[PDB]
Amino acid sequence: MIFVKNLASVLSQEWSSTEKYPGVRWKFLIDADFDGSSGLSLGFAEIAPGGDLTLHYHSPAEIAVVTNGKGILNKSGKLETIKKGDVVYIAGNAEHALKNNGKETLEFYWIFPTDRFSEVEYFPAK
Amino acid sequence: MIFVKNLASVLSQEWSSTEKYPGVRWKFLIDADFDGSSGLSLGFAEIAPGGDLTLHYHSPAEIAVVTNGKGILNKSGKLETIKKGDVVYIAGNAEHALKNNGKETLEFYWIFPTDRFSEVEYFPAK
Ligand SMILES: [Mn+2]
Ligand SMILES: [Mn+2]
């Protein structure tokens, strides 16, 4: 089983969002609920200017691949700047946030070692 | 543990390559051999024009995100065009190849649901 996706592929999928991540939206591109894939899952997120993926963690490791714009990554309390062309490693349980303080859309893919997004349990900062 | 990487973070590291797939060269940005990361591994790879990482397979599921250029994906015999902005799912042991039929350098990231690259064994097609 092999397949290809881009944003246009999922025009029909409405965006996901939540009060807790204001200015943030996302769609699933590789996910067991959608594609019947397994082992890895991937979504595409947008953080609007002024937007904030607020400090959180979860049990699986995560990789973010930044594709547009720039932001302040919050590495469990140490701030660092990220931008298009960066990849990021977030070990499980590690608290991370990402704010878009620029004027361009901060776009990135994420990846989890799981079949589905929905099997990933989110927790607010301690 | 959280960290960032881009091409510059790994200028010190050398382009590993193999005769089995010519025009192909990669480096490891997220990998236990290097970072003491776990759960996910990521590499960045380049295929020269006329370059083709020949069809093959391996236990882990795999995600490719194409960052630049254009190519032809060998979906176990079913050939699909892919381009910058495309993500690619490939199940465990699904045979896959990828040829660069463009002039630009075909660029992409790969992700494995493994700690390191150096434990994932590549088998040739049969
Ligand atoms: Mn996260
Ligand atoms: Mn492969």
Side-chain angles (χ1 to χ4, degrees):
Chain A
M1 159 181 50
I2 312 183
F3 63 81
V4 168
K5 297 277 197 73
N6 64 125
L7 275 298
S9 283
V10 299
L11 285 166
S12 65
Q13 179 189 160
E14 182 59 87
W15 294 90
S16 293
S17 76
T18 172
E19 200 289 310
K20 49 174 160 97
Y21 307 140
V24 182
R25 54 188 196 159
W26 65 91
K27 293 191 193 177
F28 313 101
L29 277 70
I30 297 169
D31 191 293
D33 297 339
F34 279 92
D35 306 304
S37 55
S38 37
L40 295 162
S41 55
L42 168 152
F44 181 74
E46 292 184 353
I47 305 193
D52 190 4
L53 171 51
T54 58
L55 195 59
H56 70 269
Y57 65 99
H58 34 65
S59 297
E62 174 185 0
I63 285 176
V65 53
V66 187
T67 50
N68 188 69
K70 65 303 185 175
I72 307 174
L73 184 300
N74 182 4
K75 298 180 306 174
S76 304
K78 65 163 305 173
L79 312 183
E80 180 177 324
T81 299
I82 60 144
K83 67 227 247 305
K84 171 171 184 177
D86 289 339
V87 294
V88 190
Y89 167 74
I90 302 157
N93 304 319
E95 286 190 357
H96 52 299
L98 184 55
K99 209 312 255 298
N100 178 18
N101 68 331
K103 242 55 167 163
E104 241 31 81
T105 299
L106 172 58
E107 295 161 25
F108 67 88
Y109 299 103
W110 76 82
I111 298 86
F112 285 118
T114 72
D115 302 352
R116 304 172 166 83
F117 178 77
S118 55
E119 82 182 296
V120 173
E121 188 183 0
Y122 272 57
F123 302 105
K126 315 291 203 165
Chain B
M1 172 189 293
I2 293 159
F3 61 77
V4 184
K5 302 291 197 63
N6 45 31
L7 281 195
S9 297
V10 295
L11 259 195
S12 51
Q13 154 176 6
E14 279 289 287
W15 295 98
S16 49
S17 37
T18 180
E19 66 156 354
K20 242 189 180 195
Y21 346 107
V24 177
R25 67 168 183 191
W26 60 88
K27 285 152 79 154
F28 315 92
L29 283 60
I30 299 165
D31 194 286
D33 291 320
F34 291 79
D35 317 285
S37 46
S38 68
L40 288 170
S41 72
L42 161 298
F44 180 71
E46 300 289 334
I47 305 185
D52 158 47
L53 88 173
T54 64
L55 91 111
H56 70 299
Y57 73 89
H58 38 63
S59 311
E62 187 173 88
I63 289 177
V65 47
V66 170
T67 55
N68 192 86
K70 231 175 300 292
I72 298 295
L73 180 49
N74 190 343
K75 292 185 309 185
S76 285
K78 289 184 193 316
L79 301 186
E80 186 173 352
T81 47
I82 68 187
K83 59 142 304 176
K84 190 219 258 190
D86 285 17
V87 295
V88 172
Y89 177 79
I90 112 189
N93 308 311
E95 296 197 333
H96 53 301
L98 179 54
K99 160 57 183 281
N100 182 8
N101 62 329
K103 285 97 184 303
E104 291 224 32
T105 297
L106 181 50
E107 311 193 310
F108 65 84
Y109 291 118
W110 82 82
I111 292 83
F112 277 143
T114 70
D115 292 33
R116 4 166 106 65
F117 173 87
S118 70
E119 80 180 291
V120 171
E121 182 164 21
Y122 287 57
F123 297 108
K126 63 279 179 174

PDB file of all heavy atoms in Angstrom, chain B residues 34-67:
ATOM      1  N   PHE B  34      23.093   9.697  16.564  1.00  0.00           N
ATOM      2  CA  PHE B  34      23.602  11.056  16.500  1.00  0.00           C
ATOM      3  C   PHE B  34      23.066  11.946  17.604  1.00  0.00           C
ATOM      4  O   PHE B  34      23.777  12.832  18.095  1.00  0.00           O
ATOM      5  CB  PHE B  34      23.246  11.680  15.144  1.00  0.00           C
ATOM      6  CG  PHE B  34      23.985  11.072  13.984  1.00  0.00           C
ATOM      7  CD1 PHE B  34      23.582   9.861  13.444  1.00  0.00           C
ATOM      8  CD2 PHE B  34      25.087  11.715  13.433  1.00  0.00           C
ATOM      9  CE1 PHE B  34      24.260   9.294  12.380  1.00  0.00           C
ATOM     10  CE2 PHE B  34      25.772  11.154  12.364  1.00  0.00           C
ATOM     11  CZ  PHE B  34      25.358   9.941  11.838  1.00  0.00           C
ATOM     12  N   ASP B  35      21.809  11.730  17.978  1.00  0.00           N
ATOM     13  CA  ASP B  35      21.109  12.692  18.822  1.00  0.00           C
ATOM     14  C   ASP B  35      20.601  12.072  20.109  1.00  0.00           C
ATOM     15  O   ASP B  35      20.270  12.781  21.057  1.00  0.00           O
ATOM     16  CB  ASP B  35      19.939  13.328  18.063  1.00  0.00           C
ATOM     17  CG  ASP B  35      20.301  13.701  16.645  1.00  0.00           C
ATOM     18  OD1 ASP B  35      21.021  14.706  16.454  1.00  0.00           O
ATOM     19  OD2 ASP B  35      19.866  12.987  15.722  1.00  0.00           O
ATOM     20  N   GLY B  36      20.537  10.752  20.148  1.00  0.00           N
ATOM     21  CA  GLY B  36      19.984  10.101  21.319  1.00  0.00           C
ATOM     22  C   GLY B  36      18.502  10.417  21.352  1.00  0.00           C
ATOM     23  O   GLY B  36      17.899  10.591  22.414  1.00  0.00           O
ATOM     24  N   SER B  37      17.935  10.527  20.156  1.00  0.00           N
ATOM     25  CA  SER B  37      16.504  10.590  19.961  1.00  0.00           C
ATOM     26  C   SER B  37      15.960   9.160  19.873  1.00  0.00           C
ATOM     27  O   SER B  37      16.725   8.211  19.693  1.00  0.00           O
ATOM     28  CB  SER B  37      16.211  11.344  18.668  1.00  0.00           C
ATOM     29  OG  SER B  37      17.051  10.889  17.614  1.00  0.00           O
ATOM     30  N   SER B  38      14.643   9.003  19.992  1.00  0.00           N
ATOM     31  CA  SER B  38      14.010   7.689  19.831  1.00  0.00           C
ATOM     32  C   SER B  38      12.556   7.818  19.401  1.00  0.00           C
ATOM     33  O   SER B  38      11.916   8.835  19.657  1.00  0.00           O
ATOM     34  CB  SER B  38      14.088   6.871  21.130  1.00  0.00           C
ATOM     35  OG  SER B  38      13.286   7.437  22.153  1.00  0.00           O
ATOM     36  N   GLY B  39      12.047   6.782  18.750  1.00  0.00           N
ATOM     37  CA  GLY B  39      10.650   6.724  18.374  1.00  0.00           C
ATOM     38  C   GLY B  39      10.469   7.074  16.915  1.00  0.00           C
ATOM     39  O   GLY B  39       9.727   6.434  16.177  1.00  0.00           O
ATOM     40  N   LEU B  40      11.161   8.116  16.494  1.00  0.00           N
ATOM     41  CA  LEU B  40      11.109   8.516  15.108  1.00  0.00           C
ATOM     42  C   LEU B  40      12.516   8.805  14.629  1.00  0.00           C
ATOM     43  O   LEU B  40      13.357   9.258  15.397  1.00  0.00           O
ATOM     44  CB  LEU B  40      10.224   9.748  14.944  1.00  0.00           C
ATOM     45  CG  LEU B  40       8.720   9.550  15.089  1.00  0.00           C
ATOM     46  CD1 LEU B  40       8.003  10.903  15.148  1.00  0.00           C
ATOM     47  CD2 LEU B  40       8.192   8.699  13.956  1.00  0.00           C
ATOM     48  N   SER B  41      12.769   8.514  13.363  1.00  0.00           N
ATOM     49  CA  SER B  41      14.018   8.890  12.735  1.00  0.00           C
ATOM     50  C   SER B  41      13.693   9.594  11.423  1.00  0.00           C
ATOM     51  O   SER B  41      12.727   9.250  10.734  1.00  0.00           O
ATOM     52  CB  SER B  41      14.884   7.669  12.464  1.00  0.00           C
ATOM     53  OG  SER B  41      14.328   6.909  11.410  1.00  0.00           O
ATOM     54  N   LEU B  42      14.501  10.589  11.087  1.00  0.00           N
ATOM     55  CA  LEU B  42      14.288  11.352   9.882  1.00  0.00           C
ATOM     56  C   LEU B  42      15.622  11.551   9.180  1.00  0.00           C
ATOM     57  O   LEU B  42      16.639  11.790   9.820  1.00  0.00           O
ATOM     58  CB  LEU B  42      13.625  12.695  10.236  1.00  0.00           C
ATOM     59  CG  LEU B  42      13.627  13.922   9.299  1.00  0.00           C
ATOM     60  CD1 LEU B  42      15.028  14.393   9.028  1.00  0.00           C
ATOM     61  CD2 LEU B  42      12.901  13.671   7.989  1.00  0.00           C
ATOM     62  N   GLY B  43      15.613  11.451   7.860  1.00  0.00           N
ATOM     63  CA  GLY B  43      16.774  11.823   7.082  1.00  0.00           C
ATOM     64  C   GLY B  43      16.355  12.796   6.005  1.00  0.00           C
ATOM     65  O   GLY B  43      15.169  12.927   5.685  1.00  0.00           O
ATOM     66  N   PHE B  44      17.317  13.506   5.444  1.00  0.00           N
ATOM     67  CA  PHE B  44      17.011  14.314   4.278  1.00  0.00           C
ATOM     68  C   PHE B  44      17.763  13.730   3.105  1.00  0.00           C
ATOM     69  O   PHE B  44      18.908  13.291   3.243  1.00  0.00           O
ATOM     70  CB  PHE B  44      17.373  15.779   4.507  1.00  0.00           C
ATOM     71  CG  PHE B  44      17.072  16.666   3.329  1.00  0.00           C
ATOM     72  CD1 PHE B  44      15.759  16.976   2.989  1.00  0.00           C
ATOM     73  CD2 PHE B  44      18.097  17.187   2.555  1.00  0.00           C
ATOM     74  CE1 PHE B  44      15.470  17.788   1.903  1.00  0.00           C
ATOM     75  CE2 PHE B  44      17.812  18.012   1.471  1.00  0.00           C
ATOM     76  CZ  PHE B  44      16.492  18.305   1.146  1.00  0.00           C
ATOM     77  N   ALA B  45      17.123  13.702   1.950  1.00  0.00           N
ATOM     78  CA  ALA B  45      17.757  13.067   0.806  1.00  0.00           C
ATOM     79  C   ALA B  45      17.621  13.872  -0.468  1.00  0.00           C
ATOM     80  O   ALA B  45      16.676  14.642  -0.634  1.00  0.00           O
ATOM     81  CB  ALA B  45      17.222  11.642   0.604  1.00  0.00           C
ATOM     82  N   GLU B  46      18.592  13.681  -1.355  1.00  0.00           N
ATOM     83  CA  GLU B  46      18.623  14.325  -2.665  1.00  0.00           C
ATOM     84  C   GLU B  46      18.804  13.279  -3.756  1.00  0.00           C
ATOM     85  O   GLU B  46      19.595  12.343  -3.625  1.00  0.00           O
ATOM     86  CB  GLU B  46      19.779  15.325  -2.746  1.00  0.00           C
ATOM     87  CG  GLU B  46      19.722  16.447  -1.723  1.00  0.00           C
ATOM     88  CD  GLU B  46      18.611  17.443  -2.006  1.00  0.00           C
ATOM     89  OE1 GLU B  46      18.217  17.582  -3.181  1.00  0.00           O
ATOM     90  OE2 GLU B  46      18.134  18.099  -1.060  1.00  0.00           O
ATOM     91  N   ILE B  47      18.056  13.437  -4.835  1.00  0.00           N
ATOM     92  CA  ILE B  47      18.258  12.611  -6.011  1.00  0.00           C
ATOM     93  C   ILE B  47      18.648  13.554  -7.146  1.00  0.00           C
ATOM     94  O   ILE B  47      17.954  14.540  -7.417  1.00  0.00           O
ATOM     95  CB  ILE B  47      16.985  11.812  -6.383  1.00  0.00           C
ATOM     96  CG1 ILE B  47      16.501  10.977  -5.191  1.00  0.00           C
ATOM     97  CG2 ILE B  47      17.240  10.912  -7.582  1.00  0.00           C
ATOM     98  CD1 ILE B  47      15.328  10.074  -5.512  1.00  0.00           C
ATOM     99  N   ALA B  48      19.782  13.270  -7.779  1.00  0.00           N
ATOM    100  CA  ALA B  48      20.232  14.061  -8.916  1.00  0.00           C
ATOM    101  C   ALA B  48      19.317  13.799 -10.103  1.00  0.00           C
ATOM    102  O   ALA B  48      18.546  12.836 -10.097  1.00  0.00           O
ATOM    103  CB  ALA B  48      21.675  13.721  -9.264  1.00  0.00           C
ATOM    104  N   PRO B  49      19.369  14.676 -11.116  1.00  0.00           N
ATOM    105  CA  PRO B  49      18.621  14.380 -12.341  1.00  0.00           C
ATOM    106  C   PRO B  49      19.145  13.088 -12.955  1.00  0.00           C
ATOM    107  O   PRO B  49      20.356  12.881 -13.024  1.00  0.00           O
ATOM    108  CB  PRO B  49      18.930  15.583 -13.236  1.00  0.00           C
ATOM    109  CG  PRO B  49      19.254  16.676 -12.282  1.00  0.00           C
ATOM    110  CD  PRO B  49      19.977  16.016 -11.146  1.00  0.00           C
ATOM    111  N   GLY B  50      18.241  12.216 -13.376  1.00  0.00           N
ATOM    112  CA  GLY B  50      18.639  10.917 -13.887  1.00  0.00           C
ATOM    113  C   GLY B  50      18.952   9.918 -12.782  1.00  0.00           C
ATOM    114  O   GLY B  50      19.298   8.766 -13.054  1.00  0.00           O
ATOM    115  N   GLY B  51      18.835  10.363 -11.535  1.00  0.00           N
ATOM    116  CA  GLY B  51      19.098   9.513 -10.388  1.00  0.00           C
ATOM    117  C   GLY B  51      17.856   8.747  -9.982  1.00  0.00           C
ATOM    118  O   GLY B  51      16.738   9.234 -10.150  1.00  0.00           O
ATOM    119  N   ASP B  52      18.048   7.548  -9.446  1.00  0.00           N
ATOM    120  CA  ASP B  52      16.933   6.663  -9.136  1.00  0.00           C
ATOM    121  C   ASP B  52      17.312   5.725  -8.006  1.00  0.00           C
ATOM    122  O   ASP B  52      18.093   4.797  -8.199  1.00  0.00           O
ATOM    123  CB  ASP B  52      16.540   5.863 -10.384  1.00  0.00           C
ATOM    124  CG  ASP B  52      15.779   4.582 -10.059  1.00  0.00           C
ATOM    125  OD1 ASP B  52      14.833   4.616  -9.236  1.00  0.00           O
ATOM    126  OD2 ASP B  52      16.134   3.531 -10.639  1.00  0.00           O
ATOM    127  N   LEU B  53      16.780   5.969  -6.815  1.00  0.00           N
ATOM    128  CA  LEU B  53      16.955   4.985  -5.763  1.00  0.00           C
ATOM    129  C   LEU B  53      16.078   3.793  -6.138  1.00  0.00           C
ATOM    130  O   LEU B  53      14.848   3.857  -6.127  1.00  0.00           O
ATOM    131  CB  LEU B  53      16.634   5.544  -4.378  1.00  0.00           C
ATOM    132  CG  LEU B  53      15.198   5.481  -3.885  1.00  0.00           C
ATOM    133  CD1 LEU B  53      15.112   5.930  -2.436  1.00  0.00           C
ATOM    134  CD2 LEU B  53      14.334   6.331  -4.778  1.00  0.00           C
ATOM    135  N   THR B  54      16.744   2.714  -6.520  1.00  0.00           N
ATOM    136  CA  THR B  54      16.085   1.594  -7.163  1.00  0.00           C
ATOM    137  C   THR B  54      15.077   0.917  -6.233  1.00  0.00           C
ATOM    138  O   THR B  54      15.204   0.973  -5.009  1.00  0.00           O
ATOM    139  CB  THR B  54      17.130   0.589  -7.678  1.00  0.00           C
ATOM    140  OG1 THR B  54      17.848   0.037  -6.568  1.00  0.00           O
ATOM    141  CG2 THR B  54      18.121   1.296  -8.601  1.00  0.00           C
ATOM    142  N   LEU B  55      14.068   0.284  -6.814  1.00  0.00           N
ATOM    143  CA  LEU B  55      13.001  -0.289  -6.004  1.00  0.00           C
ATOM    144  C   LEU B  55      13.524  -1.266  -4.953  1.00  0.00           C
ATOM    145  O   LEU B  55      14.494  -1.996  -5.180  1.00  0.00           O
ATOM    146  CB  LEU B  55      11.925  -0.922  -6.884  1.00  0.00           C
ATOM    147  CG  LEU B  55      12.045  -2.395  -7.240  1.00  0.00           C
ATOM    148  CD1 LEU B  55      10.942  -3.116  -6.510  1.00  0.00           C
ATOM    149  CD2 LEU B  55      11.902  -2.577  -8.740  1.00  0.00           C
ATOM    150  N   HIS B  56      12.861  -1.258  -3.800  1.00  0.00           N
ATOM    151  CA  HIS B  56      13.335  -1.932  -2.604  1.00  0.00           C
ATOM    152  C   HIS B  56      12.221  -1.888  -1.562  1.00  0.00           C
ATOM    153  O   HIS B  56      11.146  -1.342  -1.822  1.00  0.00           O
ATOM    154  CB  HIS B  56      14.576  -1.220  -2.067  1.00  0.00           C
ATOM    155  CG  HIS B  56      14.291   0.130  -1.483  1.00  0.00           C
ATOM    156  ND1 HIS B  56      13.748   1.160  -2.222  1.00  0.00           N
ATOM    157  CD2 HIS B  56      14.462   0.614  -0.231  1.00  0.00           C
ATOM    158  CE1 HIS B  56      13.603   2.221  -1.449  1.00  0.00           C
ATOM    159  NE2 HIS B  56      14.026   1.916  -0.235  1.00  0.00           N
ATOM    160  N   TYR B  57      12.477  -2.460  -0.388  1.00  0.00           N
ATOM    161  CA  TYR B  57      11.492  -2.487   0.691  1.00  0.00           C
ATOM    162  C   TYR B  57      12.187  -2.779   2.013  1.00  0.00           C
ATOM    163  O   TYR B  57      13.350  -3.168   2.033  1.00  0.00           O
ATOM    164  CB  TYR B  57      10.425  -3.553   0.430  1.00  0.00           C
ATOM    165  CG  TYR B  57      10.965  -4.941   0.631  1.00  0.00           C
ATOM    166  CD1 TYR B  57      10.910  -5.554   1.881  1.00  0.00           C
ATOM    167  CD2 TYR B  57      11.563  -5.634  -0.418  1.00  0.00           C
ATOM    168  CE1 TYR B  57      11.421  -6.824   2.077  1.00  0.00           C
ATOM    169  CE2 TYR B  57      12.075  -6.906  -0.234  1.00  0.00           C
ATOM    170  CZ  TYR B  57      12.001  -7.496   1.014  1.00  0.00           C
ATOM    171  OH  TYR B  57      12.512  -8.759   1.206  1.00  0.00           O
ATOM    172  N   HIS B  58      11.464  -2.602   3.112  1.00  0.00           N
ATOM    173  CA  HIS B  58      12.014  -2.813   4.445  1.00  0.00           C
ATOM    174  C   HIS B  58      10.887  -2.788   5.460  1.00  0.00           C
ATOM    175  O   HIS B  58       9.904  -2.058   5.287  1.00  0.00           O
ATOM    176  CB  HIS B  58      13.013  -1.721   4.786  1.00  0.00           C
ATOM    177  CG  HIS B  58      12.611  -0.376   4.272  1.00  0.00           C
ATOM    178  ND1 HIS B  58      11.469   0.269   4.697  1.00  0.00           N
ATOM    179  CD2 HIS B  58      13.175   0.427   3.343  1.00  0.00           C
ATOM    180  CE1 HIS B  58      11.355   1.418   4.057  1.00  0.00           C
ATOM    181  NE2 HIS B  58      12.377   1.538   3.230  1.00  0.00           N
ATOM    182  N   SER B  59      11.046  -3.582   6.516  1.00  0.00           N
ATOM    183  CA  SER B  59      10.020  -3.748   7.547  1.00  0.00           C
ATOM    184  C   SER B  59       9.239  -2.470   7.861  1.00  0.00           C
ATOM    185  O   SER B  59       8.014  -2.448   7.757  1.00  0.00           O
ATOM    186  CB  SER B  59      10.623  -4.291   8.852  1.00  0.00           C
ATOM    187  OG  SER B  59      11.450  -5.411   8.621  1.00  0.00           O
ATOM    188  N   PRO B  60       9.945  -1.406   8.260  1.00  0.00           N
ATOM    189  CA  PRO B  60       9.219  -0.255   8.804  1.00  0.00           C
ATOM    190  C   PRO B  60       8.294   0.390   7.778  1.00  0.00           C
ATOM    191  O   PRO B  60       8.547   0.324   6.575  1.00  0.00           O
ATOM    192  CB  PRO B  60      10.343   0.728   9.183  1.00  0.00           C
ATOM    193  CG  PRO B  60      11.603  -0.072   9.178  1.00  0.00           C
ATOM    194  CD  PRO B  60      11.396  -1.174   8.191  1.00  0.00           C
ATOM    195  N   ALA B  61       7.218   0.992   8.263  1.00  0.00           N
ATOM    196  CA  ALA B  61       6.444   1.917   7.457  1.00  0.00           C
ATOM    197  C   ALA B  61       7.317   3.158   7.202  1.00  0.00           C
ATOM    198  O   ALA B  61       8.279   3.418   7.935  1.00  0.00           O
ATOM    199  CB  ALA B  61       5.153   2.300   8.180  1.00  0.00           C
ATOM    200  N   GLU B  62       6.983   3.922   6.167  1.00  0.00           N
ATOM    201  CA  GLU B  62       7.825   5.036   5.767  1.00  0.00           C
ATOM    202  C   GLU B  62       7.004   6.211   5.275  1.00  0.00           C
ATOM    203  O   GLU B  62       6.010   6.042   4.566  1.00  0.00           O
ATOM    204  CB  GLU B  62       8.792   4.578   4.675  1.00  0.00           C
ATOM    205  CG  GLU B  62       9.860   5.582   4.262  1.00  0.00           C
ATOM    206  CD  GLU B  62      10.865   4.961   3.297  1.00  0.00           C
ATOM    207  OE1 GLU B  62      10.635   4.999   2.073  1.00  0.00           O
ATOM    208  OE2 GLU B  62      11.881   4.408   3.758  1.00  0.00           O
ATOM    209  N   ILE B  63       7.419   7.408   5.666  1.00  0.00           N
ATOM    210  CA  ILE B  63       6.828   8.625   5.136  1.00  0.00           C
ATOM    211  C   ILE B  63       7.901   9.445   4.422  1.00  0.00           C
ATOM    212  O   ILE B  63       8.991   9.662   4.949  1.00  0.00           O
ATOM    213  CB  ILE B  63       6.119   9.449   6.234  1.00  0.00           C
ATOM    214  CG1 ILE B  63       4.833   8.739   6.667  1.00  0.00           C
ATOM    215  CG2 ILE B  63       5.800  10.859   5.732  1.00  0.00           C
ATOM    216  CD1 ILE B  63       4.065   9.428   7.811  1.00  0.00           C
ATOM    217  N   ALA B  64       7.597   9.845   3.197  1.00  0.00           N
ATOM    218  CA  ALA B  64       8.421  10.822   2.487  1.00  0.00           C
ATOM    219  C   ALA B  64       7.652  12.111   2.331  1.00  0.00           C
ATOM    220  O   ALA B  64       6.483  12.100   1.959  1.00  0.00           O
ATOM    221  CB  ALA B  64       8.834  10.308   1.125  1.00  0.00           C
ATOM    222  N   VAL B  65       8.307  13.222   2.635  1.00  0.00           N
ATOM    223  CA  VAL B  65       7.759  14.522   2.281  1.00  0.00           C
ATOM    224  C   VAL B  65       8.692  15.185   1.268  1.00  0.00           C
ATOM    225  O   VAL B  65       9.867  15.425   1.542  1.00  0.00           O
ATOM    226  CB  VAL B  65       7.518  15.404   3.521  1.00  0.00           C
ATOM    227  CG1 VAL B  65       8.733  15.390   4.426  1.00  0.00           C
ATOM    228  CG2 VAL B  65       7.142  16.829   3.106  1.00  0.00           C
ATOM    229  N   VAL B  66       8.165  15.434   0.079  1.00  0.00           N
ATOM    230  CA  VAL B  66       8.957  16.012  -0.997  1.00  0.00           C
ATOM    231  C   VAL B  66       9.068  17.508  -0.823  1.00  0.00           C
ATOM    232  O   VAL B  66       8.062  18.209  -0.769  1.00  0.00           O
ATOM    233  CB  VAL B  66       8.344  15.708  -2.358  1.00  0.00           C
ATOM    234  CG1 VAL B  66       9.041  16.516  -3.457  1.00  0.00           C
ATOM    235  CG2 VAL B  66       8.410  14.193  -2.625  1.00  0.00           C
ATOM    236  N   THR B  67      10.306  17.985  -0.748  1.00  0.00           N
ATOM    237  CA  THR B  67      10.586  19.379  -0.422  1.00  0.00           C
ATOM    238  C   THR B  67      10.965  20.209  -1.648  1.00  0.00           C
ATOM    239  O   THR B  67      10.893  21.433  -1.619  1.00  0.00           O
ATOM    240  CB  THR B  67      11.720  19.461   0.610  1.00  0.00           C
ATOM    241  OG1 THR B  67      12.863  18.748   0.120  1.00  0.00           O
ATOM    242  CG2 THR B  67      11.266  18.838   1.932  1.00  0.00           C
TER     243      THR B  67
END
